[PDB]
């Protein structure tokens with residue numbers, strides 16, 4: 001008899017529909033529409049010219065390596081560089097095809113159908129999507145400008161032992177929250193206090209607007225002796241998101257598992273991409289970082305000064321200290337889906353908060369990104385938003 | 395703490411003969427017949443350095459910026475043109491290795507029955523195993539999968555899908571003749587079954603004509619149950635990790651949705667580079683490889699007919715890049731692996747190629763990396779180690 005795909009599929013097929021966060025992210029990007037949706041890094045920072053140069057030099061001088069199957073752990077020097085950067089040995093670094101893959105790997109080796117997974121609400125759609133594929137039970141705690149609610153977390157931890165906690169300490173997506181050094185130390189003790197695994201996504205490590213970067217769960221934990229933290233770093237927010245080159249740092253025991261999972265995922269991360277990324281960070285990484293901080297800091301200050309003028313104070317909006325997000329909250333009882341369609345009529349866009357909630361929620365919240373627009377688009381965008389934002393209040 | 399923290403999937407991934415025993419086949423001076431690496435001589439060094447340098451310069455903003463999962467439109471159209479289908483039916487992945495990971499994730503649940511030959515591509519076993527399926531294997535030979543043993547399985551079991559490599563299967567090199575394909579398709583259409591067709595070796599036939607693909611016989615028949623997998627790893631570069639999946643629209647979406655959770659999208663730099671290199675004289679490039687493997691394969695068999703004892707058999711591949719050897723039952727290929735080192739030569743023991751164990755008296759031989767002398771020299775050392783084993 002005929003083929004009914006809908007039933008030919010397995011269970012996982014239904015745990016990744018992703019059909020509403022696609023139709024809604026599509027309605028935008030039309031004619032003259034300024035958008036604050038999507039997390040596309042600032043394009044002007046892409047190092048074209050020297051990427052072109054490094055790529056040719058690489059393919060021409062070592063083409064029989066960049067084009068040949070390569071080790072799964074990753075390109076040797078790249079690993080050395082990441083180790084020397086983070087502060088660990090090469091054998092503790094696994095190059096991945098973006099943090100998105102590492103997330104997927106993490107889920108494959110840690111989650112089982114029904115398993116307990118702890119993360120924040122809201123959180124990164126990437127982790128949610130990847131994890132959801134393993135049909136776990138999502139345990140959550142709300143997150144605010146001071147990071148995750150550590151108390152709420154204590155009562156959830158005493159009631160159940162989650163396979164691991166997925167945190168985003170530095171400038172969490174989508175709130176843009178920052179977890180203070182104190183909270184981080186408390187959160188570390190709660191973890192060592194129960195031998196729990198912590199997955200630290202530090203994609204925005206270097207996007208701190210302040211005069212310095214607060215240490216990480218990985219650092220704090222490593223300088224204690226505890227190896228239950230898995231550090232996930234990426235180059236998608238400092239170099240290029242398209243190259244798809246990231247890494248995962250962890251204790252050998254777990255590392256081993258990720259490597260074998262990785263292998264079955266795509267054999268290995270493209271070699272060119274790995275060598276390319278290296279040939280750009282071995283030269284002036286410090287000033288490159290320095291150069292990116294200023295760019296986002298600038299767009300941030302601009303995003304805020306415009307929000308303060310056009311946005312009535314009946315609605316709250318975070319004040320980002322790093323990263324590329326502004327988490328907005330409409331008064332209770334009001335919807336973002338409504339604000340969204342009101343906004344499109346004013347030719348502006350954002351992402352309703354809903355999809356950032358593992359178990360659903362944030363019906364009155366929404367995320368705003370300011371990393372892809374101009375100090376004029378930013379401003380022109382906020383004018384329109386707050387305009388529609390004003391048309392919804394009634 | 396750690397082991398008491400993982401999950402079922404962590405046990406279905408123990409990478410043994412892949413990232414453990416492959417370090418011994420590396421030392422000082424030992425010719426290796428292990429590992430299926432494509433010939434490096436075919437790699438377009440200068441043409442790629444030019445295309446790449448130009449992509450980063452002229453259109454580097456789309457090359458380095460996040461891209462919609464599916465893939466560089468021009469590459470999908472090119473692939474669509476090549477395979478004989480449309481751009482919307484094509485999905486670009488990070489190597490076929492991924493498509494096998496995306497299929498496992500979409501059709502398999504713990505317990506799910508999957509059918510694939512025994513032996514078959516380790517990559518596929520690995521990709522699937524992670525799901526906890528139940529493997530139904532059918533013996534594979536010079537003519538392909540044992541269709542009788544197969545119909546005898548379709549009469550009891552109903553696999554979520556059948557995984558087959560009709561053209562120069564890894565590791566045997568067997569080639570399924572058109573009639574056998576016609577039969578096989580007749581069997582899955584009669585039962586509305588899914589078939590994942592892996593054509594990594596589509597273009598590597600030493601003859602002068604490629605055989606109709608299961609995707610081709612099917613599309614022509616009207617049946618949409620085939621998911622055609624294709625790669626660029628054996629005809630351009632394996633390290634670029636650029637491949638594709640051609641399937642029915644409704645099955646493609648789920649694969650697309652699965653891919654985003656995997657790596658978001660395939661590096662766009664790589665996709666554009668591949669397209670840049672193939673919009674020009676593809677046919678000639680294909681003939682150059684067809685020649686090199688044909689050329690290396692003839693040298694491989696010759697060295698074998700001149701060195702291997704008669705009490706041991708090996709396949710005579712009509713395409714591909716492998717030669718599958720089988721010692722007389724009872725004799726270990728893993729033991730041989732020890733007398734092979736004494737002789738400074740190596741190969742891949744067959745065990746890992748059997749989804750459900752067994753066949754420990756067989757092993758795979760790859761030659762694509764060696765050249766005329768390595769072939770002859772290695773087959774001479776392998777031929778010697780064999781005499782040792784046949785020396786009781």
Ligand SMILES: *Cc1c(COP(=O)(O)O)cnc(C)c1O
Pocket residue numbers: 039097098099100101124126168172173201203233234235236237241244245246657658
């Ligand atoms: C942008 C982002 C990443 C980067 O993902 P990649 O797959 O490495 O490109 C990872 N985590 C978070 C929270 C992000 O916002």
Ligand SMILES: *Cc1c(COP(=O)(O)O)cnc(C)c1O
Pocket residue numbers: 266267430488489490491492515517559563564592594624625626627628632635636637
């Ligand atoms: C080489 C090969 C592939 C190609 O895998 P990639 O991920 O594209 O490098 C797929 N299937 C088989 C049987 C192969 O031998």
